[PDB]
């Protein structure tokens, strides 16, 4: 049982490391996508402004 408990603790620590790494990975991906989506929204709003400028003629 001592051997089994040590093995279990090692694998549990491995899984904890895994969840931590995945949490950083998802936080980074989310930030990158937030920046890109803001870029897209800005592009769309500027395009709407352009469209009204051409209609103004």
């Amino acid at each position: 049982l001592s051997d089994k408990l040590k093995e279990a603790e090692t694998r549990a620590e491995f899984a904890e490391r895994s969840v931590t790494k995945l949490e950083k990975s998802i936080d980074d991906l989310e930030d990158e996508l937030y920046a890109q989506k803001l870029k897209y929204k800005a592009i769309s709003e500027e395009l709407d402004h352009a469209l009204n400028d051409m209609t103004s003629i």
Partner: protein
Amino acid sequence: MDAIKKKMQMLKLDKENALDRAEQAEADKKAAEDRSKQLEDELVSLQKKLKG
């Protein structure tokens, strides 16, 4: 996107209309100037006639 695509034809038409309007205005200006010159020549001729 579709808005700008179809309205671009409208922009092209506006440019062409402005060009054609300028051309027609210049042509009518030339015609008016010619007729004015001929009328002036006739007026001076008739003024000489009246003086005589």
